[PDB]
Amino acid sequence: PSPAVVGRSLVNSFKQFVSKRHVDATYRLVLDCVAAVDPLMRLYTFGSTVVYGVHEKGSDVDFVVLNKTDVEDGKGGDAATQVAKGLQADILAKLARVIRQKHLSWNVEEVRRTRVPVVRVKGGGAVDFDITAYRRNGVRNSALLRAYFEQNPPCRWLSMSIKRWSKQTGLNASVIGGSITSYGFNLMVVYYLLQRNHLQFVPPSTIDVSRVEPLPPHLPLEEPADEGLELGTQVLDFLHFFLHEFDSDKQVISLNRPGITTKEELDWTKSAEDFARMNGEKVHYQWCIEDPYELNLNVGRNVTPLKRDFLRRHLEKARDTALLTIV
Template sequence: MIDKSPIGNTQFPEDCDGTQGNLPVEAGNCSVIHTCDICPKVIFESEKALERHIEIRHKSLMEGINFLLGKEHSDFTIELSDEKRAALGAKAFDVAKKRDAGHGMLECASIARQQLQRIVDVWHPGAEVFIFGSSLVMSSWDGKSDIDFAVVDPHAYVQRKWPPEEKNAVRELTDLCKSAGFKVSSLECVDTARVPIVKHKTLQDSLLNTVANTKPAEKARRSICLTYRSEKVKTTEALRAWLEKETETATIEEIIDEGQCNATVTFTTSTNAMVAMIKVNNGQKRRLNEYFSARIMDERFPPEAHCIDFDLCLRQFGIRNSEYLRKLHTLYDNSPFLRSGAVVLKEWSKLWGLNNSFMGFLTSYAINIMWIFFLVKRDVIPYASPYDTPENPREALREPTYVPILPQSAGSSEVQIKMGSLLADFFKFYATEFDWEKNVVSLNRPGITTKKSIGWTSENEIKLSRQSKNVQYVVCIEDPYEPNLNLGRHLGVCKARKIKAEFRRAALSVINDNADECIMFTSKYKKQVQVPIKEPPREIFEEVQKVVYDSFGSTGAQFTPDSLRQMLIESCPNAFQALSNYWNWKILVRRLGLRQVGDQIHKRACFDFLSEKLRGKPAFKVPVQGSPIKAVGRDTIDDCAVAPVCTPNIVKASFTPFSPLSRQHSCGFQRLHSHSLGNVLKMLRFTRI
């Protein structure tokens, strides 16, 4: 059976069952294993078999990509007029200017670093917090993107004693962040990644919406609410003395007694307020017969570190990488080409799916390396060895100094023409000139670096790793510092073709479209080529449902995948064939409330619920005058009744305030809003399949 569900030319499916029609082979049966980077757990014994699989299985996906890759080189050699180059350059400068939120926003990031430093001081007094990534490289911040922080002890690093055991470290730092007032729902301890991190995702849209300059907001940001029960603390003066002793600082500005052992304490700075919360909450464990608890006074105006999205790691490589790129951008940026071009290419790569590490594509760092490599090859900037940047983080900047992305020279026509020429040439370079089959994008050495010279060949690829450490050398971008690290290691045949096709798409758009319609700045064409994934007619799906539920419910029969497929072919051949045109076998089994374990088909926990719902019976009763969560749960079931399958998105949409019945249960929605979607599904008695 072939999956024929339509997929847009620029989207990759998240799940694809590629076992049909291709029998897996053992790794020892052939010298080189070929894998499809879209279909999991499928291998091929020859490159020809892999190409046949891609042609059949992913025909709709690869059709547009193959069309772009089949373009002649002559299509990319058309010269641009000076007017068009100037228009492209002016548009690029306009995009870059919008990503520069000014000195004040970068100052907020610096304050957030200082607040995280106080958290780290409690965990490891000798460690320091560094800002790295695009904020350091660009010496500016837009106030919306996340900020990368690294925690490093320079003294321990010199002695080769850093980092510590990272999994335990990020767990301890996550707990300390909670004691500093960070919401549990906004923190995530990612301890299973290649680089363990503490991830913070704020619930606000952006820092611009939360950082206000009004006096009430500024005062609220440096105030905390304190709840205490102690025989020693009876008056505000006693509370002030206790706080100054506990926090080892005398920065209290005002204490207001709220009654019933509650007080509002205002400090001189928001950083001091956060330190007080850490000291009070973290020290509760060693207190006997006393209770002290501190929290943020106003959730609308928390300290600066609470208002930004950030990733916090314990690796030093990011600091050195960013310091190297920062020096390139600042030392050779006499004209505003480097940083403006990097900002535009970052936006373009995210817009068209190239910059998406979660789906196994590239990162902003890799795109930046490609931009610098291109400028070196075109002699726009001289080559600078990355090894000239000191390894010791003690010599690196803790936080960047603000430098405007656009100097005054960006308004001249000559500079705009040059900017437009460089961006157009960048896409042409990687679309037609650079040899992806033989060469490596590398700043580690001057000249050309070949795959063979550093051993990045197909014979040395790592595939089918149980620890998800697969490495492929189809697209090769060498990291300047981490040894033997390919930044394009997750790109297989299909994803690599998409990368190359997008460079060609952009190069053709630069030639054929005006600046406002160029896909370097807009996703207009992307929206046109996306094809929505269609759902099958409900009556067809219910016909198959009824056959399956009758077979499992009445007879209690046990099925294997082959016997279940044969039963569907005999009982409802037309409906089963129609569903096969929309879903592959793996998805169909899930939609029916079943799961395949080995050679057996088992019922999921939601099977009985779906079966009773098909027959018009309520799965469970919820009283009209019930708890808010139950009321919203009833509303969710009503909203989901119109869909063939209850998906998480449908559930999520059903308990938003825009749902007609949920407007009557706003208190229930507020309770649900503080939970993750997984917890909401459990509370509503749904099972995610």
């Protein structure tokens, strides 16, 4: 299809998303529980809610519980140690006890499979959220992607379109056999928009957690006023870029620098894979996405040679189906 047809199917697919801040009350409900553990402890919001400034249907909320001194140290990295991890699980255990006590109908899951300790909460009516502890990086990288989407608010449509597709096609980490998170696809979307000068480079070091809102304001979204021409033009060029312009053997998707970053300058090579192990397992350096804040973290670490295969196929197949909408 032409950019226009792609644009039109996309605006048409999002028709019921635009119909109907509502997160405040949940923030307050979560703050109740947090305060019964420690009334000096803070609650911060992060994820898509903060990144877009809109709360989507079928998205959880992301919360982190911070101490005063965790905030004031607004630019510290986050310790990747066993005691750090221990500390977070201990506080999260207490808070889970309290959440269960106060809300008997809620499922409160202490998730231990992961690299970052997390409590997953389903109350059963899209009351839906995760809680973490004592980490700045979630709030920090979310303010970074929010900084960019604010330079150019309509780009939130390209990213929302890519996100929904990733989940539909099973590429998204959230689906069985998926390899890239929603977070990784955003880093790809921004990286792309920066390469096309739709966005002005922001150094990740300029983001200060002590200057961020624990609950940031709503950021109005409006329909494309061109019957989605720019959306469809962006989408087609996005796919072209990651298909025929981005050189995955030699390059890294990164917001740490403007221009090109090579795998070679990072030591993200075959030799590194043999030495590697992350979260307990094999890291892959097939599809490279650099984390702006964490040391030596590839967000694309789960992209096996096979999943690199699937990804390209879908990038080819998305050109003709308008991200699975024109079918």
